[PDB]
Design a protein around this nucleic acid. Structure first.
Ligand SMILES: [Mg+2]
Ligand SMILES: [Mg+2]
Ligand SMILES: [Mg+2]
Ligand SMILES: [Mg+2]
Lengths: 48, 164, 209, 138, 129
RNA sequence: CCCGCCGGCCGCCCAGGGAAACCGGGAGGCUCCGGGCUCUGGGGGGAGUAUGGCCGCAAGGCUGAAACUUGAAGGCAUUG
RNA sequence: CCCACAGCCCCCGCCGCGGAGCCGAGGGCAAGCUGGUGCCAGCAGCCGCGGUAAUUCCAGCUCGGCGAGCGUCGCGCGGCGCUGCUGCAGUUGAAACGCCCGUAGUUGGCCCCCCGCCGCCACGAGGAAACGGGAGCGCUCCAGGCAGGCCCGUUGGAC
């Protein structure tokens, strides 16, 4: 009946990424030098 | 009207007709990594220049060898390419021009000549040093990373005599 | 266990009597054994790709019967290309059949020069056209450094065939992959059957083979 | 063969193309003049008008509004897309109305709607739905 | 009615070659046909031919030896600038290496290479390769 | 009687062509895409409708829109 | 230092603020984890999602594109060989007037060895620059401008 009825976690304070060109450098070591695939749920289970 | 209306202006780069193409993305990223490129407009500028060279070479090649226009334009183009160092000295045929690639353009950048002289630890180190103004191209200090160095000045690119 | 040839050509190939695949193509012998192509390519120089995978259904008394059809190409990036198809109830066996069929049929691709003759050939010899279904393809020689001007699918074939510079034009319902690939394959196959004046030289036949 | 090909036949070719190029629906709609007069937007990017009433295989009712263009005085309906934006529009509020992606034609499952609402009281709808700005002045 | 004798002659020749014959007949015996055949013969496509008189549009006989793939005419003779030939070359012939385009000039019937050498142009008659 | 020539009406068909059914006395000689002349068509509806003009005793014929609407309508063929 | 006066660029000494957003993650189209709601609210250029795992809505995490720019709306070009001169189609998909005669119009077999005329091709004159192409010159590069060095083609600004 009430619109917006469907429409709390504190944000995780973590350091910002290295902007500028370093971001590209961050990707370069992300997949090639560092072991990859990406997107599995079980992969995040490893991350947690 | 104001005199400012007669100042000419034009763009200098192009964008790929198909943007999302995996091989192109990977190749562009790889070239950025080997040359420490900021954004992707520089590759577009390089491709623009290469396209101009190739089109001129084609038009001259369609014509006869003994065409006066052919002689004139080819001589000018060869002289410019050689003075820039992009094309090897031993080559003086217009046919070789069609085989040039943007990598030869990159190799004559200020960062490139700086690094291959072993004057810098890396492309990123070279860029940061260039910004701080520690380099004296010829006898004049230059703070433009994309400055292109001719053959006659490659032996003359040194450290700034004023830098600490 | 081992490869026991089932054909005279297979036996001769098992023996070191035949030394090159071009020695086979010159007399238009049909190929039926997949072992023959690996013997000339011991190190597995040939590449492989899976262009498409589609599902085909047949109506029956009880529900539907489904199946899978696959298209595969292979090449060593140096004047050799092949196209093949396979259909089966399961995807993997269909892919294996398609790869086997593509390996079975293979043709050489002739290459030439655009204007200046310097170094190795870099593009097609001349204009080539092919026809399959509603699709038509035109291959035009190009200058050095021009890249491959074509759609991603056709460019894959031209890459696996060992070309670097070429212009292409397409017509018809190009969204049908099988017929586009077939048309380009036919155009490439026609390459070595096109007379040119340098081949006007009159050569006497050879009794051997 | 079918077409003329003589060396002194350019006039006929020009006339034939002139006559036959009117058969295309797009060319007609663009160069004929009927649509421009019949379009309540008269070739403009978007219009400024005044709202006067709120109304709304998929079975979801879409929220829209009836509007009258200031410069034209003809009536149309424009549809407010972004969630929760019905409450942000009040009766008799100045609005700016543009078009959907398909010029002229209807878009999506919405019957009889061919426009969009992008501003109310001078504030972008997107800037308000994300809470960047606020409509406290109205 | 009959108009372009050259087109009919060329079509007959190509049809005969397709089934690998050796001798053909062509009713018209125009001068333009004769020069076209002369150029073909000199370049090495058709070898020999003879003209058979009869006082009523003489007939001509030609011999075949393969080689020839295609040959046609351009029905309305365009005007070709001396400097505007590469476009036609690319549009019509398979490759820039081989092939001959026939142009009629004030200097006589010649091939596009010859005219390119003399830096002059004219009207186009046909082509073959 | 059988061996031919011209013209006409037909059947089957190698190549070739085509999305295919099929054509093959061309629907062949065409993306390798130019013999000459004329006419018609540009997604489906609204609509061969309205409004004008001409012809006709009349019934009606020739010419011939737009607004608006819509995401498919169609061709040949395959299995049930 | 420059400037009609002031700024501003640049040079010189002292102290020294390091800051990225806009779109999207089913296909076209590069880019995936829980909580809500339940054909409601909403997304969606097209196909489509949502009637209890919602890979498409609403939030968090993660990820991708471009980048001091990003996205939306309308118009033109291209996409388009869907206006087709190059270069469409006309048995069955939309499309050969029911047939004949016939004027304007368009198109017209072969042949003459050198004369005149029209078209045609090449060259030339003559006539504005800017823009465009283009020779040469390191405004720190560049967008630009026609400069500039010492012992300069009469320094150059050609075409
Ligand atoms: Mg045609
Ligand atoms: Mg059409
Ligand atoms: Mg219609
Ligand atoms: Mg029909």
């Amino acid at each position: 009946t009430s619109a917006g009825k469907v429409r709390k976690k504190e944000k995780k304070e973590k350091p910002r990424p290295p902007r500028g060109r370093a971001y590209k450098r961050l990707l370069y070591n992300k997949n090639f030098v560092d072991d990859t695939r990406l997107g599995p749920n079980n992969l995040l289970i490893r991350q947690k | 009207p104001r005199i400012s209306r007669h100042r000419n202006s034009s763009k200098t780069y192009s964008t790929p007709k198909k943007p999302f193409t995996k091989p192109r993305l990977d190749a562009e990223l790889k070239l950025c990594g080997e040359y420490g490129l900021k954004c992707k407009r520089e590759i577009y500028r390089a491709r623009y220049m290469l396209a101009k060279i190739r089109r001129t070479a084609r038009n001259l090649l369609t014509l006869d060898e003994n065409d006066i226009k052919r002689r004139f334009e080819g001589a000018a183009l060869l002289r410019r390419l050689h003075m820039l160092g992009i094309l090897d000295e031993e080559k003086d045929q217009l046919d070789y021009v069609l085989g040039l690639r943007i990598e030869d353009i990159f190799k004559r950048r200020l960062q490139s000549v700086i690094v291959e002289s072993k004057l810098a630890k890396s492309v990123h180190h070279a860029r940061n040093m260039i910004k701080a103004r520690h380099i004296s191209v010829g006898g004049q200090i230059v703070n433009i990373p994309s400055y292109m160095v001719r053959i006659s000045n490659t032996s003359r690119v040194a450290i700034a005599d004023t830098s600490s | 266990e081992e490869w026991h040839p089932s054909t005279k050509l297979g036996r001769l190939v098992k023996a070191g009597k035949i030394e090159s695949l071009y020695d086979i193509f010159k007399y238009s012998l049909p190929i039926k054994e997949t072992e023959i192509i690996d013997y000339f390519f011991p190190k597995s120089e040939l590449a492989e790709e899976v262009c498409n995978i589609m599902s085909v259904q047949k109506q029956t008394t009880a529900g539907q019967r489904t199946r899978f059809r696959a298209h595969v190409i292979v090449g060593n990036r140096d004047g050799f290309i092949g196209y093949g198809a396979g259909v089966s109830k399961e995807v993997a066996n269909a892919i294996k059949k398609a790869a086997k069929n593509a390996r079975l049929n293979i043709v050489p691709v002739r290459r030439g020069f655009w204007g200046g003759k310097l170094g190795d050939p870099h593009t097609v010899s001349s204009k080539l056209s092919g026809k399959c279904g509603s699709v038509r393809v035109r291959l035009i020689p190009a200058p050095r450094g021009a890249g491959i001007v074509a759609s991603p699918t056709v460019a894959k074939v031209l890459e696996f065939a060992g070309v670097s510079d070429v212009f292409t034009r397409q017509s018809g319902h190009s969204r049908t992959l099988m017929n586009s690939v077939g048309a380009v394959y036919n155009a490439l196959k026609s390459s070595y059957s096109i007379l040119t004046p340098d081949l006007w030289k009159k050569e006497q036949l050879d009794h051997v083979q | 063969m079918s077409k003329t090909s003589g060396l002194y036949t350019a006039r006929k070719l020009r006339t034939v193309r002139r006559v036959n190029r009117w058969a295309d629906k797009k060319y007609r709609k663009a160069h004929l003049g009927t649509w421009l007069k019949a379009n309540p937007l008269e070739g403009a990017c978007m219009a400024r008008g005044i709202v006067t009433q709120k109304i709304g295989p998929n079975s979801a009712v879409r929220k829209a509004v009836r509007v009258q263009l200031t410069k034209n005085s003809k009536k149309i309906t424009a549809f407010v897309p972004r969630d929760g934006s019905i409450t942000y529009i009040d009766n008799n509020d100045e609005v700016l109305v543009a078009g959907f992606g398909r010029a002229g034609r209807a878009v999506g499952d919405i019957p009889g709607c061919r426009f969009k609402v992008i501003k109310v009281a001078g504030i972008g709808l997107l800037a308000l739905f994300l809470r960047k700005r606020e409509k406290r002045a109205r | 009615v009959r108009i372009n004798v050259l087109r009919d002659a060329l079509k007959s020749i190509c049809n005969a070659q397709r089934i690998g014959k050796k001798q053909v007949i062509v009713r018209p015996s125009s001068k333009v046909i004769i020069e076209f055949l002369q150029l073909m013969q000199k370049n090495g496509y058709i070898s020999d031919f003879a003209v058979v008189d009869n006082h009523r549009s003489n007939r001509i006989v030609v011999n075949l030896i393969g080689r020839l793939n295609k040959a046609g005419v351009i029905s309305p003779r365009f005007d070709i600038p001396a400097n505007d030939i590469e476009k036609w070359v690319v549009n019509l012939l398979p490759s820039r290496l081989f092939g001959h385009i026939i142009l009629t000039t004030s200097q006589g019937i010649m091939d596009h290479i010859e005219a390119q050498h003399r830096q002059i142009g004219g009207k186009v008659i046909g082509y073959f390769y």
